[model samples]
Target: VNPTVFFDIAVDGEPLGRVSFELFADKVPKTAENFRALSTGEKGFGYKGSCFHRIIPGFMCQGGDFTRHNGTGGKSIYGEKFEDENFILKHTGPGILSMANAGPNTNGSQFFICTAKTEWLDGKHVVFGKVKEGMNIVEAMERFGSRNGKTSKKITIADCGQLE
Candidate 1:
């Protein structure tokens, strides 16, 4: 029941769909574990109703900071920022899920889904998961969610309800 995590993607408070992801636990065990922990409230924090606070159209829709409705909060299950997994995975195209951070080895609970080719981010962010399904929803967020580096009032994770 807990092997794979199905991120129930939402849009403007509607149940648009869900994206199933396969964690590269073998290549990026720490990163995968942290994401799973935050998503499940392994201890007390989880991405259960968070907003997509940073939406860069044609780039990515980033969220998961349940502690902050803005783009300035969230922590790992380890209770602080952590190092990068630096896996071999590349940021190829749409539906690419990667860590959202300020700089190197600063990954936290924030994450971003690519809606277009972001080859420039290949080695900059930790590529931990790919959108196995429901990529259309991400594309919708990109096309109709927000632009000019703003938050998507049209979308929120809506399930990261357990963060603190």
Candidate 2:
């Protein structure tokens, strides 16, 4: 079965809700494992306490930069970065989860959950999963977002782990 994970989110210290995701492990094994392992924190490093560093209402909310807590840093378990598993998945609609990279094969711990259709990013990013529940919380996050990707308040993954 596909591994599922959850992120208990909070905005500015107030609890928002839980956002659970279903990783597309069957299709993107490496990419999916990267996210699953990160969620579980079995490697001593993970996504907990990381702020959603970039929020764009009409696009996606990006995070996973636990090292910097700001979008500038994060690393894959494989190393500082890893290759794009494949371009088989597409950002056809909202709630799509995909990697955030600086360029080709630069994927690390950073990821984004699409809040709107972003077909333009289809082949450039590796889509590994989608939100399985609690999308309303994601919509709530939109109110704090700006076109320039700035957020009025901090949106953080207060807690995260694999769901059995």
Candidate 3:
């Protein structure tokens, strides 16, 4: 069966909604592994309770920084940075999920869900998954607010996990 993951969002401690994803493991094994590990808390480290650290309206909703709750902190389940898989996946529309990184092959723990067409990032980021369900929820989350690379003033990921 295809592996899947789901993340629940909360606003001011209230349940906002759940976003479901189907990981592209076959295409991006290592990158997908890192994401799966974080979602499942493989080493007592995960995206649970981590806030979405960066937001941009026409771009994406960034999260998975379980430490520091800012864009500056986060790592992989492998305990170190790894080279990008750069699978054939493309960020062509809303709900496309991709790894957030500083440069090529520097993927760690940070990720973002594209709320709009962001084809500009196709060759630069590792696209690992797409929103299998809950695009509306993602849109709502994006609509909450964002700009200038700042976390949303009112959104947080209360929990995130995967269902093998």
RMSD of each: 3.6, 0.8, 1.4
- Sort order, lDDT high to low: 2, 3, 1
Which of the numbered candidates is closest to the native, going by highest TM-score? 2
- Predicted candidate 2 versus true structure: per-residue lDDT over 42-155, tens digit per residue: 999999888998898878999999999888899999976999889999998989999999999999999999988999898899999999999998899877889999999999
Best lDDT among the predictions, by candidate number: 2
Provide the global lDDT of candidate 3 against the true structure: 0.83
TM-score of 2: 0.98
Q: List model 3 lDDT by residue over 1-164, tens digit each.
A: 55799889997689989998988888988887788888888789888888886778878899887787878889988768788887599888988989989897788899999988888887899999889988888877777665686644557878788865
With candidate 1 superimposed using the best TM-score fit, by how many Å does residue 51's alpha carbon deviate from the native?
1.1
Better of 2 and 3 by lDDT: 2
Give me the displacement of residue 84 in model 2, in angstroms.
0.6
Can you give the TM-score per candidate against the true fold?
0.87, 0.98, 0.93
Tens-place lDDT per residue, model 1, 51-118, is 77778888888888788777799888886899987758888888878998899989888998888888
Candidate 3 lDDT trough over 10 residues, lowest sum: 145-154
Which wins on TM-score, candidate 1 or candidate 2?
2
Residue 86 of model 3 has an lDDT of 70
